[PDB]
Amino acid sequence: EPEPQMVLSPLTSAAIFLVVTIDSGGEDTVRDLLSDVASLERAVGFRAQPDGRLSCVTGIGSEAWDRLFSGARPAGLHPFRELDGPVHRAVATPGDLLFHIRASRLDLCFALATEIMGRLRGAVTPQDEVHGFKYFDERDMLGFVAGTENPTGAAARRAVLVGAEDPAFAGGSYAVVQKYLHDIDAWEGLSVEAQERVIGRRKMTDVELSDDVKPADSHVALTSVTGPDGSDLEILRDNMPFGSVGREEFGTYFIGYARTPEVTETMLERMFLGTASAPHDRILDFSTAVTGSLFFTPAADFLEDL
Amino acid sequence: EPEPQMVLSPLTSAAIFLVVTIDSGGEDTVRDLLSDVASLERAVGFRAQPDGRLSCVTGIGSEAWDRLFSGARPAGLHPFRELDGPVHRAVATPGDLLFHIRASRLDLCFALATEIMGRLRGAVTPQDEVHGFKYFDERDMLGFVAGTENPTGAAARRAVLVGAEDPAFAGGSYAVVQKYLHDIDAWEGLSVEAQERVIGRRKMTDVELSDDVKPADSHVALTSVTGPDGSDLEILRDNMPFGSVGREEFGTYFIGYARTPEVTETMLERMFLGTASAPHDRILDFSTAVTGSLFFTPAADFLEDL
Amino acid sequence: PEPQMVLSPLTSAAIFLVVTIDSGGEDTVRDLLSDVASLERAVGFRAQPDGRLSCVTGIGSEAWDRLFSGARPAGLHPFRELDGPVHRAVATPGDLLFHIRASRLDLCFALATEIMGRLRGAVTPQDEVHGFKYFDERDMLGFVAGTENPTGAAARRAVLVGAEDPAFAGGSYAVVQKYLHDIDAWEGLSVEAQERVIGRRKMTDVELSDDVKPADSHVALTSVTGPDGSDLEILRDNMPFGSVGREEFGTYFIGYARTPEVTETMLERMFLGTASAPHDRILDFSTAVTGSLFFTPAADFLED
Amino acid sequence: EPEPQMVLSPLTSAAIFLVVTIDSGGEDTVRDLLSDVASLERAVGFRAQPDGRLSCVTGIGSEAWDRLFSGARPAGLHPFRELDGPVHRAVATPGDLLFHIRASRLDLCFALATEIMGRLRGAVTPQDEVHGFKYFDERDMLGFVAGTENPTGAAARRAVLVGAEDPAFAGGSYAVVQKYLHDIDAWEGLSVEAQERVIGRRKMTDVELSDDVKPADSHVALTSVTGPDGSDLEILRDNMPFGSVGREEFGTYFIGYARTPEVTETMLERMFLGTASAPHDRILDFSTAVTGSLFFTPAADFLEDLS
Amino acid sequence: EPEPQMVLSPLTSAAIFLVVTIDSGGEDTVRDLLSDVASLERAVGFRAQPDGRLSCVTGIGSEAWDRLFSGARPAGLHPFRELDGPVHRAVATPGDLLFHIRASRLDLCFALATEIMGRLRGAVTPQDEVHGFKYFDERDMLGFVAGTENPTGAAARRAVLVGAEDPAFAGGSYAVVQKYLHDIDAWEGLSVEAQERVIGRRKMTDVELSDDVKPADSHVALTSVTGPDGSDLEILRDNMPFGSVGREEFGTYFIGYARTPEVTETMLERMFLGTASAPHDRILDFSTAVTGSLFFTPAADFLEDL
Amino acid sequence: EPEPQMVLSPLTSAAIFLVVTIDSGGEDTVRDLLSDVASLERAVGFRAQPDGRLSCVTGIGSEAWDRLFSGARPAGLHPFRELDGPVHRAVATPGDLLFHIRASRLDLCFALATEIMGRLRGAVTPQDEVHGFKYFDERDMLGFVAGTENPTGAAARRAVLVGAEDPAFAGGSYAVVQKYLHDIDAWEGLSVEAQERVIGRRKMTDVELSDDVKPADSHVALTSVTGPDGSDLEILRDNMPFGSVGREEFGTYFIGYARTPEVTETMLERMFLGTASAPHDRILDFSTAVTGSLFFTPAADFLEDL
Ligand code: HEM
Ligand code: HEM
Ligand code: HEM
Ligand code: HEM
Ligand SMILES: [Mg+2]
Ligand SMILES: [Mg+2]
Ligand SMILES: [Mg+2]
Ligand SMILES: [O]
Ligand SMILES: [O]
Ligand SMILES: [O]
Ligand SMILES: [O]
Ligand SMILES: [O]
Ligand SMILES: [O]
């Protein structure tokens, strides 16, 4: 059986998201780090157990894949597709490696990020570094409970992990990242009732709006997708608030894991391009994407045997 | 008896330090915020009891004091004194207001900082914003336990709180801040034994080096000071690690509270200018001050009664 | 097939809600059943992961016929009243059971509020009990309660419907009885006399050896061996409850099993006695004031 | 410095409020129990240290005081004063003894309530019993954070504990209890902003409404009282949610401690009878008081030195 | 004004009791260690703040006091008084220094005991070392709750701390230690009701037996003492269970703190020699004392100034 | 189908290791206790759910197996093999039964140990009893993190549990125990860099030394073993510190679970007898084995069905 990376792990109160590009001739240094990254995770995390809950998920971009490895490519791997909607745009930004670092404490994230970047100095250029913090009541930067409808157990495994459709990369997953900045002044001008119509859930109680009152351009309505079979298409999201009060930056770092990028890309199409019944997702009237990248997160044993 | 701010409260795992200057015409907006800051601390923190441990200490600079208030000035309040040592410099940087925000979680610090800065928008200019995190084993950025010789109980109250020497300001304190960036590459080039001789304590066990072994130019030696009366002069320090792995920023945010700035200033003179037996504090060969500001943190009732 | 949380452990808080379905309330009920997993997530996610909020939903025999056409679960019937020589196990009305558990009563109450809010005008409440953990997993008699519950594979085998009734695999049967205790009479016994009623040591919870365990002890009468000589097991989530002012010191009994026959055999031995035992001596200190039987379907049965 | 009961202690996650009346001839049994109540609290609580946080505050009503004790009365002790407003009524209901029991767990509350009621069986009649629970982030059944502006440290000591004004009773306090039931159907028909105008604080973030927007008939406006010298008059509230989903009971158990009942009573007069600017507290349009009792909670040493 | 050691602090889940004798010529080494013990306590304890709750109380015996110090002695400091009852004996055993180490975790106790014994190697001989542990709900090896009637708050300060009756030694206290082994076989031969008549409290619920059923020879009856003026004479007990299952050793380590040894010794006389109404404390029919030592625990500042 | 004992369970903060020999005629009493040990575990542990995490793993020695049972032996069961190296010796010491008792608290361990030994009194003779405790951030007495490279999940199950190679004993495991005492004086004389060369990892950060600097006689180098097929051969180690400060006993209690003893024995051979490039494991220059025993820990249902 192939060992997945910790893609199925739950939300934690802290995260570091590190996106880098591989400099010309940095390939060899990168391959050596990838073969050690699970051992670095154990080195930093084991002594802080059991409360630490440290994990690192490592992702590799479409272009970087061709630079690093000969042989088969994962079937779903391609650069992030820019979406030019009538009003809102999903931008594509450079990204060769993702490190999705989670723990109960920011210091354990930082210590692992320090060892990884120590090994990669002179081989990579940092593109994005975000320090995420969840609110103590599981709320995001808009004041809503975040993660409620994430799949669990066998449903999560089936939605997130590559299987027989691409057997050489079984136990892998696809990660889409987008850094969003919010217009908090505009958001806080809405009544609570208006905010609930944007999201599609009650703010205090987190109960879903019933189908007769849920607007067709609510976040929950547009990111609800049924397959040909009639079955719900699901992703696993580990979204984190981040910000700087001095710079008035109040953000959500979106990360969504799926067995194929087509599920996440369908949701993004419905959000940015809309449908017959909805011009666009009302959350984008308060949220601007400033990054967008797609990564393949291989099985742990693929990184180890390299 | 006057009610002090939470200057005596213990170290926490998260902090936000905010330093701002007051723009032209900003004084009325600032006075309104000062009269409300304790009530905002309760609004953000109460619902997160008892695990939240949210506090805010508010400080006011020498020039800002004269802009905001008529009548008496605290006896020790003056702008930070630059020290131009033969090798190392303690710089002065602008700062009218300090908010020293502590909690068990960064998101609680961030929520109070958001409310404070929301009320000050258009009246202030941000000078500095640092998000602090302690390592899970009470270690600083240099790998040493930080806080060990802080005073506690009655000795802390005597060391930190203004009393009858300045009775109109009793229950106040003086805060000096300095942001330090470390040369971690040079520090990690030392053996553990050489680092212990820089600090003056054992790294793993935190046991102080004996007087026979402890170098005259160690941090513990130079920051150990006796008054004319033979008594130890003590300050309370809430130093926090901070940084950015992508930018290679690895820092210690120094904050020290004391009943009179003369004690903190004497320690800084010994570190930066040295003594007969030591050229300077050896910690400064690995640590560059990039900010320096002095604040008076009044009694809580002083701020309430505006 | 995915079961409801019938295999989940004891928690420190619980709400037990039993209602009857009023005439014409069927459609409101079916809509709520299709939504109960989503309500559970909605309330529970506000306290992940320590909250441990779950709701197990059960349906009575008469309600089943009012709600669904086609196949019945093989073991579903109304609770069988037992009229013993001394003690009686009463059958009381109940169409729906909500077995709500969490680490905190707030999560239980918030979920109960949303469920009952959705069913207002469609159901009549019959029983509501707010259970709480009592010291080191003790009951109102001062004994540790749950010790011999099966775990892991033995729990799955004992609790979940399998191939014997394949349309309903991953279901279970719940029996509930609210008991009120005579604490005055109980505290009149020596600790040694109480140990002989239960069949375990009071402070240390060690089982009495077979040579000393009375045949009419609770542990002896509820020990049943199946055709192959293996133990027939149930999973019990008993919770203390009460009201000091009204002198109500209670045990809310709930037992899950793959077939009701196992639980019913245990109840027959307790209430009717055997050749060796007049009745379960625990009943000399405990009166059953409710009795109901429910089928707790697979989670997938409810969503569909 | 005489030793107070645990009146200054913080909110906990569980509580039992027990109100009883003393039957004729029950006085000797009650005095005996009062002399033992601190020892019973230690007997239950000590084995759950350090996390248990079990405490019991024992209060005695005006008429019970006269039956139990032959000497001096606390200066402020009198029966609860019924308030007959143009719209709303604050009823006075019987209660001789209050047990305010708090812990981090209901089991410790229940076990201590069991031991106390076991000692008083046949001497007292139960009037009210409420099992309170913390609801999410210190919320009440109206969805608002409750307790935010409670005084702390020295301010709490000054606001709550009897001192030199009544020296024989120094370290005592005065507790007012009211059981409120809420009309949740009517409450949930308001917009969140209309709820915020009833309470005077933001619902989700618990920030006080600015003075320009805070209505005069908001809860926070009517329960804000200044003394003649301009300083705030404060009380310490340990309010707890309770209820029963089947019976549609969604309750707030109000308890307020103060150094003199005059402060709590001035707040109640403003709520129920209103001011020049406000007819009544808008919170009462959604809240009905069904009990009302006043108790003196003596210093701990006063109870210990009985017979 | 004088700062007591942590004699008033509550029970913890772990303790180490270390009793040593001072070798001939060990006096100087011992004096240097005593002046450093508070600094060693902070060095170990600070890196587990705030849940560690590490503390060390240092006690000095009567014969050791006269070897270490000159001038005035604490008024009540004498060797433990052997009690030769008709049936039961309280033995006196050697001991010059007591280290009473408590924390929430054994590791912090063990690390501090290691640093102390490292400084004293070749100057002292170990007489007794006991690792204590919390047993369920504050129970002892007899199955009863132990510590229930300890004084708290002001009553504890008044019972425990030397004051104006011996002003030079204000802030000190007197510790009596006795290691007890229990005859568990004999004890378990009693019914629970017989055990309750030995102790004087209910076993499961820890409710005191009423005055009309409490035997005169029960432990609670003989250890209840009133002064000539009617007030209760109280001690503070920090008893801890210990044992070794292989050796069939089930113990109680008794430690009682009091402002004068006369209170503790009056209790011991009643237990071992009895009263007019009681031959001896029935708890002694199931408990054997194998050590007995008395120590003065000076104010913290007395040790620091050496 | 067969239910293993709790061999795969994680490290806990407390342990008791009990090794006994079966006295002549004690066989019938032992068989009765083996059939009840799981019942005793529930009796003590249930009341402390869910935080207690009490488990007992019961092991039987080679000589004991033939005294207790008729019919098939586990294929790998033999007496511990004494290793007589040029410098260091791995002694074989008597042991018929192992009880490996773990929990989050020592009380639960002690209570279960008391019930087991109460049933075995007069049938067994105790050989060793060790009370283990967690030391800071999962450290051993040498000050290094211990457990870091233990296998987890599927890799742990594959490394530890007997499968189809010995189908009658599927779900069993083999436990090797060795009690080590450390020369802390000699160890603490080494610089941290020289200690790192003994172990093969960085002391404070627990990062593995790179292959270019790791000495061939380091602990990590000698306990790293590859099968003929190139895979890593793994064991599960649940090592616990123990000690007594007055007796200068600073111990590591070694316990290693494996699907076959040949893996553990290959590691011991390399440590004690060395390789072409290493005389012996340098850790043995600071560590003396004083016990050595091998046990088969059967499937839980094997014990239940006696
Ligand atoms: C500013 C960015 C975002 C914010 C603040 C945000 C917030 C939320 C919230 C509050 C919910 C409801 C509770 C939950 O189930 O987590 C939700 C649901 C969801 N979001 Fe987002 N979201 C954002 C971006 C995205 C993006 C970019 C996607 C997909 C590409 C996405 C996919 C989903 C999905 C699939 C659900 C679950 C819908 C359901 O089936 O109920 N979100 N989000
Ligand atoms: C530049 C970055 C700094 C770092 C990384 C640092 C770190 C440390 C460490 C590790 C200790 C030993 C443990 C303890 O906290 O007692 C210490 C002690 C101390 N530091 Fe700093 N420190 C810094 C700057 C300062 C400054 C600027 C001052 C004063 C103006 C200061 C004053 C002290 C004092 C008074 C002590 C206690 C010494 C004693 O009496 O034992 N430190 N510091
Ligand atoms: C007054 C109501 C009850 C009380 C207070 C009570 C209490 C207990 C206690 C203290 C135990 C021993 C520890 C353990 O849980 O294994 C026990 C065991 C048990 N009880 Fe009950 N019980 C009650 C009613 C029932 C009922 C109504 C049934 C069955 C229909 C039942 C079935 C069992 C079973 C099967 C065991 C396990 C026996 C074994 O195999 O060891 N109980 N109960
Ligand atoms: C249905 C009954 C009640 C409910 C739901 C309720 C709820 C609240 C809420 C939500 C607050 C705002 C947060 C805070 O606690 O500071 C508050 C404040 C307060 N309440 Fe109540 N309350 C009730 C009855 C009472 C009564 C009867 C009194 C006095 C007799 C009282 C006195 C106060 C006071 C003094 C404040 C603080 C006002 C300030 O200075 O800001 N409340 N209450
Ligand atoms: Mg009978
Ligand atoms: Mg206020
Ligand atoms: Mg014996
Ligand atoms: O999301
Ligand atoms: O510092
Ligand atoms: O049960
Ligand atoms: O309130
Ligand atoms: O004691
Ligand atoms: O190891």
Numbering used by the authors:
A (entry chain B), B (entry chain E), E (entry chain A), F (entry chain C): 7 to 312
C (entry chain D): 8 to 311
D (entry chain F): 7 to 313
Sentences from the paper on this structure:
However, the lifetime (stability) of Compound I varies among the variants, with the D152A variant displaying no spectral changes for ∼1 h, while for the N245A and D152A/N245A variants, the Compound I spectrum decays toward that of an Fe(III)–heme spectrum within 10–15 min. Data collection and refinement statistics of the H2O2-soaked structure determined at 1.90 Å resolution are reported in Tables S1 and S2, respectively. The structure reveals that w2 and w3 remain present, with no new H2O molecule observed. An electron density peak is observed directly above the heme–Fe in each monomer of the hexamer assembly. However, owing to the longer Fe–O bond length, we are cautious to claim this structure as a “pure” Compound I species, where Fe–O bond lengths of between 1.63 and 1.73 Å are expected. The longer time scale for the extruder measurements may allow some decay of Compound I (see the kinetics of Compound I reduction below). A recent XFEL study reporting the Compound II structures of yeast cytochrome c peroxidase and ascorbate peroxidase highlights the possibility of flexibility inherent in Fe–O bond lengths between peroxidase species. However, regardless of whether an Fe(IV)=O or Fe(IV)–OH species is formed, Compound II bond lengths (1.76–1.88 Å)6,8,14,16,17,47,50−53 are consistently longer than Compound I bond lengths, and thus, for reasons further discussed below, it could be that the D152A H2O2-soaked structure is more representative of a Compound II species.
Using an X-ray free electron laser (XFEL), we have previously determined room-temperature (RT) serial femtosecond crystallography (SFX) structures of the ferric and Compound I redox states of DtpB,26 a B-type member of the dye-decolorizing peroxidase (DyP) family. DtpB, therefore, represents an exemplar of a His–heme-ligated peroxidase in which the distal heme pocket favors a dry site. By disrupting the distal heme pocket Asp–Asn–Arg triad in DtpB, our RT-SFX structures reveal that a wet site can be formed.
